[PDB]
Amino acid sequence: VGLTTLFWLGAIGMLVGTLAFAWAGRDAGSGERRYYVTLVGISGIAAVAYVVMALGVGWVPVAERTVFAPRYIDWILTTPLIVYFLGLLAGLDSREFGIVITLNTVVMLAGFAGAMVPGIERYALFGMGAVAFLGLVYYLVGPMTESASQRSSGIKSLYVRLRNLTVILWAIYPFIWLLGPPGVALLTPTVDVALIVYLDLVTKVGFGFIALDAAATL
Ligand SMILES: [Cl-]
């Protein structure tokens, strides 16, 4: 199994999620539609990014490594949508959304920038992202959880389930980044991509399926 193959697998998984979310939201009352649309965009954008990488585009040479630019474009656009989904579920107002969305953006921008910087100073960008990430986790586990507590028992339960999925799985990315080509380059590009393809699929499609389950049960 090579990079190309791993990218195709990611494209296929994202496509399956995209189609399922689009279908399940066919009707969608008039206030629940928002959730389905966000899911379609999250997995849809990732699907495109993976096909692009699978076709060999965006493989940017940096120092003695390769940076998959599409992955980062994908993250920058999709992770804020995931955060939006959680904030909607938690019942946040504009100001609340604004804070978590910017922290999220700082994480992804710093990571992309760090990956694109050849020198050892790139770790300074990585650190910036790590710090903003802790801020994001704080909001997810604190204020946003407090806000969610004002919703029905089911919604609060779905929020908690997805919050846990997000906090735990997202916290893993920085380590894979630090151990893979972007950092120490211990893990080969293939192993790093394999691990990240799984993580992207679960944080997006796994995330979506869990939500659909809750919606159905509700
Ligand atoms: Cl990369």
mmCIF file of C-alpha atoms and ligand atoms in Angstrom:
data_model
loop_
_atom_site.group_PDB
_atom_site.id
_atom_site.type_symbol
_atom_site.label_atom_id
_atom_site.label_comp_id
_atom_site.label_asym_id
_atom_site.label_seq_id
_atom_site.Cartn_x
_atom_site.Cartn_y
_atom_site.Cartn_z
ATOM 1 C CA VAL A 1 0.000 0.000 0.000
ATOM 2 C CA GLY A 2 1.395 3.354 -1.086
ATOM 3 C CA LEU A 3 0.489 7.007 -0.555
ATOM 4 C CA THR A 4 -1.659 7.087 -3.695
ATOM 5 C CA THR A 5 -3.664 4.105 -2.451
ATOM 6 C CA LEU A 6 -4.105 5.582 1.036
ATOM 7 C CA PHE A 7 -5.314 8.839 -0.512
ATOM 8 C CA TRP A 8 -7.858 6.958 -2.650
ATOM 9 C CA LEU A 9 -9.135 5.144 0.440
ATOM 10 C CA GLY A 10 -9.591 8.497 2.139
ATOM 11 C CA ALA A 11 -11.411 9.851 -0.922
ATOM 12 C CA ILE A 12 -13.727 6.842 -0.994
ATOM 13 C CA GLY A 13 -14.522 7.023 2.722
ATOM 14 C CA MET A 14 -15.253 10.738 2.496
ATOM 15 C CA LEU A 15 -17.465 10.158 -0.567
ATOM 16 C CA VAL A 16 -19.482 7.491 1.255
ATOM 17 C CA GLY A 17 -20.024 9.827 4.200
ATOM 18 C CA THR A 18 -20.907 12.751 1.943
ATOM 19 C CA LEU A 19 -23.554 10.758 0.058
ATOM 20 C CA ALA A 20 -25.079 9.343 3.255
ATOM 21 C CA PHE A 21 -25.291 12.718 4.980
ATOM 22 C CA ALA A 22 -26.774 14.323 1.855
ATOM 23 C CA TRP A 23 -29.405 11.597 1.648
ATOM 24 C CA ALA A 24 -30.361 11.560 5.338
ATOM 25 C CA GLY A 25 -30.944 15.304 5.115
ATOM 26 C CA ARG A 26 -33.163 15.129 2.017
ATOM 27 C CA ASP A 27 -36.248 16.253 3.940
ATOM 28 C CA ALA A 28 -34.789 17.760 7.123
ATOM 29 C CA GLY A 29 -37.486 19.770 8.886
ATOM 30 C CA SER A 30 -36.492 23.418 8.552
ATOM 31 C CA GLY A 31 -34.294 23.922 11.587
ATOM 32 C CA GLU A 32 -32.381 20.647 11.524
ATOM 33 C CA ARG A 33 -31.289 21.042 7.907
ATOM 34 C CA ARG A 34 -28.384 23.247 9.009
ATOM 35 C CA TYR A 35 -26.683 20.284 10.689
ATOM 36 C CA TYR A 36 -26.886 18.040 7.622
ATOM 37 C CA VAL A 37 -25.577 20.760 5.313
ATOM 38 C CA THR A 38 -22.520 21.232 7.548
ATOM 39 C CA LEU A 39 -21.813 17.487 7.484
ATOM 40 C CA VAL A 40 -22.014 17.418 3.684
ATOM 41 C CA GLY A 41 -19.530 20.280 3.419
ATOM 42 C CA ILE A 42 -17.129 18.748 5.944
ATOM 43 C CA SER A 43 -16.853 15.355 4.230
ATOM 44 C CA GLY A 44 -17.377 16.802 0.748
ATOM 45 C CA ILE A 45 -14.427 19.175 0.919
ATOM 46 C CA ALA A 46 -12.236 16.424 2.380
ATOM 47 C CA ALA A 47 -13.285 14.071 -0.422
ATOM 48 C CA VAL A 48 -12.123 16.602 -3.025
ATOM 49 C CA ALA A 49 -8.848 17.235 -1.209
ATOM 50 C CA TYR A 50 -8.126 13.501 -1.035
ATOM 51 C CA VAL A 51 -8.913 12.896 -4.721
ATOM 52 C CA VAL A 52 -6.572 15.782 -5.583
ATOM 53 C CA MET A 53 -3.779 14.260 -3.520
ATOM 54 C CA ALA A 54 -4.604 10.802 -4.865
ATOM 55 C CA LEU A 55 -4.130 12.186 -8.385
ATOM 56 C CA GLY A 56 -0.715 13.418 -7.277
ATOM 57 C CA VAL A 57 -1.447 17.156 -7.036
ATOM 58 C CA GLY A 58 -0.248 19.411 -4.207
ATOM 59 C CA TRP A 59 2.785 17.326 -3.253
ATOM 60 C CA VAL A 60 5.002 20.268 -2.291
ATOM 61 C CA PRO A 61 8.752 19.638 -1.735
ATOM 62 C CA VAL A 62 10.024 21.366 1.411
ATOM 63 C CA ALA A 63 13.615 20.810 2.501
ATOM 64 C CA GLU A 64 14.001 17.025 2.517
ATOM 65 C CA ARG A 65 10.296 16.208 2.795
ATOM 66 C CA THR A 66 6.939 16.446 1.044
ATOM 67 C CA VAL A 67 4.059 18.627 2.222
ATOM 68 C CA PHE A 68 0.548 17.675 1.129
ATOM 69 C CA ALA A 69 -0.897 21.154 0.729
ATOM 70 C CA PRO A 70 -4.436 19.923 -0.046
ATOM 71 C CA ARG A 71 -4.652 18.296 3.371
ATOM 72 C CA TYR A 72 -4.107 21.678 5.025
ATOM 73 C CA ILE A 73 -6.490 23.540 2.740
ATOM 74 C CA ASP A 74 -9.014 20.862 3.691
ATOM 75 C CA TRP A 75 -8.347 21.200 7.448
ATOM 76 C CA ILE A 76 -8.512 24.997 7.369
ATOM 77 C CA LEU A 77 -11.972 24.814 5.796
ATOM 78 C CA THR A 78 -13.462 21.734 7.467
ATOM 79 C CA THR A 79 -12.330 21.941 11.098
ATOM 80 C CA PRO A 80 -14.151 25.256 11.569
ATOM 81 C CA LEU A 81 -17.287 23.549 10.234
ATOM 82 C CA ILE A 82 -16.868 20.787 12.814
ATOM 83 C CA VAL A 83 -16.541 23.435 15.517
ATOM 84 C CA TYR A 84 -19.629 25.205 14.137
ATOM 85 C CA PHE A 85 -21.569 21.927 14.362
ATOM 86 C CA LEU A 86 -20.619 21.540 18.029
ATOM 87 C CA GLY A 87 -21.415 25.167 18.837
ATOM 88 C CA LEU A 88 -24.815 24.890 17.180
ATOM 89 C CA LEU A 89 -25.496 21.784 19.256
ATOM 90 C CA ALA A 90 -24.281 23.564 22.404
ATOM 91 C CA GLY A 91 -26.399 26.623 21.611
ATOM 92 C CA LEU A 92 -23.716 29.309 21.322
ATOM 93 C CA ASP A 93 -24.281 32.926 20.311
ATOM 94 C CA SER A 94 -22.180 34.862 17.774
ATOM 95 C CA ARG A 95 -19.531 36.000 20.273
ATOM 96 C CA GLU A 96 -19.095 32.446 21.537
ATOM 97 C CA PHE A 97 -18.757 31.096 18.006
ATOM 98 C CA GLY A 98 -16.312 33.830 17.081
ATOM 99 C CA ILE A 99 -13.848 32.909 19.815
ATOM 100 C CA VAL A 100 -13.679 29.160 19.165
ATOM 101 C CA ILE A 101 -13.617 29.587 15.395
ATOM 102 C CA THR A 102 -10.621 31.945 15.529
ATOM 103 C CA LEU A 103 -8.702 29.702 17.945
ATOM 104 C CA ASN A 104 -9.396 26.800 15.582
ATOM 105 C CA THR A 105 -8.136 28.836 12.611
ATOM 106 C CA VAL A 106 -4.939 29.716 14.495
ATOM 107 C CA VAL A 107 -4.338 25.993 15.012
ATOM 108 C CA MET A 108 -4.695 25.083 11.324
ATOM 109 C CA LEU A 109 -2.890 28.149 9.961
ATOM 110 C CA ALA A 110 0.068 27.636 12.304
ATOM 111 C CA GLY A 111 0.283 23.946 11.389
ATOM 112 C CA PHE A 112 0.218 24.638 7.646
ATOM 113 C CA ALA A 113 2.765 27.434 7.975
ATOM 114 C CA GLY A 114 5.016 25.295 10.157
ATOM 115 C CA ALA A 115 4.867 22.428 7.666
ATOM 116 C CA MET A 116 5.837 24.839 4.877
ATOM 117 C CA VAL A 117 8.835 26.297 6.751
ATOM 118 C CA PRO A 118 11.994 24.227 6.102
ATOM 119 C CA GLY A 119 14.057 25.480 9.032
ATOM 120 C CA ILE A 120 14.020 24.526 12.697
ATOM 121 C CA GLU A 121 12.040 27.721 13.451
ATOM 122 C CA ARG A 122 8.980 25.918 12.095
ATOM 123 C CA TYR A 123 8.565 24.443 15.574
ATOM 124 C CA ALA A 124 7.712 27.940 16.808
ATOM 125 C CA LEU A 125 4.667 27.853 14.537
ATOM 126 C CA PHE A 126 3.791 24.360 15.759
ATOM 127 C CA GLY A 127 3.883 25.588 19.350
ATOM 128 C CA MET A 128 1.556 28.486 18.541
ATOM 129 C CA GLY A 129 -0.946 25.970 17.213
ATOM 130 C CA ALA A 130 -0.559 23.760 20.276
ATOM 131 C CA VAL A 131 -1.329 26.693 22.578
ATOM 132 C CA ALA A 132 -4.412 27.776 20.604
ATOM 133 C CA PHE A 133 -5.520 24.127 20.630
ATOM 134 C CA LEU A 134 -5.450 23.999 24.446
ATOM 135 C CA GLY A 135 -7.593 27.126 24.393
ATOM 136 C CA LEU A 136 -9.985 25.360 22.019
ATOM 137 C CA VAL A 137 -10.147 22.297 24.296
ATOM 138 C CA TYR A 138 -10.841 24.594 27.254
ATOM 139 C CA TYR A 139 -13.852 26.050 25.499
ATOM 140 C CA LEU A 140 -15.084 22.630 24.381
ATOM 141 C CA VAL A 141 -14.842 21.101 27.860
ATOM 142 C CA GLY A 142 -15.818 24.215 29.820
ATOM 143 C CA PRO A 143 -18.023 27.086 28.545
ATOM 144 C CA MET A 144 -19.471 25.121 25.618
ATOM 145 C CA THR A 145 -20.302 22.167 27.861
ATOM 146 C CA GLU A 146 -21.913 24.577 30.315
ATOM 147 C CA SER A 147 -23.956 26.042 27.469
ATOM 148 C CA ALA A 148 -24.992 22.599 26.215
ATOM 149 C CA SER A 149 -26.367 21.776 29.667
ATOM 150 C CA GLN A 150 -29.264 24.099 28.846
ATOM 151 C CA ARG A 151 -30.469 21.815 26.051
ATOM 152 C CA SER A 152 -32.627 18.688 26.246
ATOM 153 C CA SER A 153 -31.088 15.568 27.781
ATOM 154 C CA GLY A 154 -30.664 14.009 24.347
ATOM 155 C CA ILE A 155 -28.950 16.987 22.734
ATOM 156 C CA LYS A 156 -26.667 17.404 25.730
ATOM 157 C CA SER A 157 -25.836 13.717 25.339
ATOM 158 C CA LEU A 158 -25.081 14.024 21.651
ATOM 159 C CA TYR A 159 -22.935 17.087 22.368
ATOM 160 C CA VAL A 160 -20.983 15.220 25.048
ATOM 161 C CA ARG A 161 -20.488 12.208 22.797
ATOM 162 C CA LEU A 162 -19.186 14.315 19.880
ATOM 163 C CA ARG A 163 -17.157 16.599 22.164
ATOM 164 C CA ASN A 164 -15.318 13.563 23.536
ATOM 165 C CA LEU A 165 -14.726 12.168 20.067
ATOM 166 C CA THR A 166 -13.332 15.517 18.952
ATOM 167 C CA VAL A 167 -11.166 16.362 21.963
ATOM 168 C CA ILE A 168 -9.533 12.935 22.161
ATOM 169 C CA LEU A 169 -8.968 12.351 18.438
ATOM 170 C CA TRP A 170 -7.912 15.920 17.633
ATOM 171 C CA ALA A 171 -5.355 15.818 20.462
ATOM 172 C CA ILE A 172 -3.647 12.963 18.603
ATOM 173 C CA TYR A 173 -2.893 14.886 15.393
ATOM 174 C CA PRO A 174 -0.138 17.051 16.873
ATOM 175 C CA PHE A 175 1.770 13.950 17.980
ATOM 176 C CA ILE A 176 1.539 12.328 14.542
ATOM 177 C CA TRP A 177 2.658 15.642 13.067
ATOM 178 C CA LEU A 178 5.559 15.882 15.502
ATOM 179 C CA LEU A 179 6.666 12.283 14.802
ATOM 180 C CA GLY A 180 6.117 12.338 11.049
ATOM 181 C CA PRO A 181 7.863 14.227 8.197
ATOM 182 C CA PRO A 182 6.718 17.691 9.400
ATOM 183 C CA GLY A 183 8.717 17.183 12.585
ATOM 184 C CA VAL A 184 11.284 14.556 13.572
ATOM 185 C CA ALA A 185 10.508 12.482 10.469
ATOM 186 C CA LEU A 186 10.573 9.237 12.464
ATOM 187 C CA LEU A 187 7.367 7.837 10.995
ATOM 188 C CA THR A 188 7.580 7.433 7.225
ATOM 189 C CA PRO A 189 5.282 9.456 4.945
ATOM 190 C CA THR A 190 3.140 6.368 4.265
ATOM 191 C CA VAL A 191 2.638 5.472 7.922
ATOM 192 C CA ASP A 192 1.899 9.095 8.792
ATOM 193 C CA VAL A 193 -0.651 9.396 5.983
ATOM 194 C CA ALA A 194 -2.274 6.061 6.908
ATOM 195 C CA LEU A 195 -2.789 7.191 10.496
ATOM 196 C CA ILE A 196 -4.108 10.602 9.437
ATOM 197 C CA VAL A 197 -6.500 9.107 6.873
ATOM 198 C CA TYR A 198 -8.070 7.050 9.661
ATOM 199 C CA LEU A 199 -8.273 10.088 11.956
ATOM 200 C CA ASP A 200 -9.800 12.299 9.242
ATOM 201 C CA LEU A 201 -12.400 9.627 8.446
ATOM 202 C CA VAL A 202 -13.447 9.205 12.078
ATOM 203 C CA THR A 203 -13.447 12.878 13.060
ATOM 204 C CA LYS A 204 -15.601 13.641 10.003
ATOM 205 C CA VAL A 205 -17.556 10.602 8.805
ATOM 206 C CA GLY A 206 -17.530 8.779 12.146
ATOM 207 C CA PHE A 207 -18.577 12.085 13.692
ATOM 208 C CA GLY A 208 -21.409 12.418 11.170
ATOM 209 C CA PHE A 209 -22.718 8.876 11.627
ATOM 210 C CA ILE A 210 -22.849 9.279 15.401
ATOM 211 C CA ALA A 211 -24.950 12.411 14.915
ATOM 212 C CA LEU A 212 -27.316 10.670 12.481
ATOM 213 C CA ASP A 213 -27.813 7.919 15.044
ATOM 214 C CA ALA A 214 -28.782 10.472 17.696
ATOM 215 C CA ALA A 215 -31.126 12.233 15.278
ATOM 216 C CA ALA A 216 -32.822 8.956 14.375
ATOM 217 C CA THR A 217 -33.154 7.894 18.008
ATOM 218 C CA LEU A 218 -34.514 11.328 18.919
HETATM 219 CL CL CL B 1 2.096 17.097 5.116
#
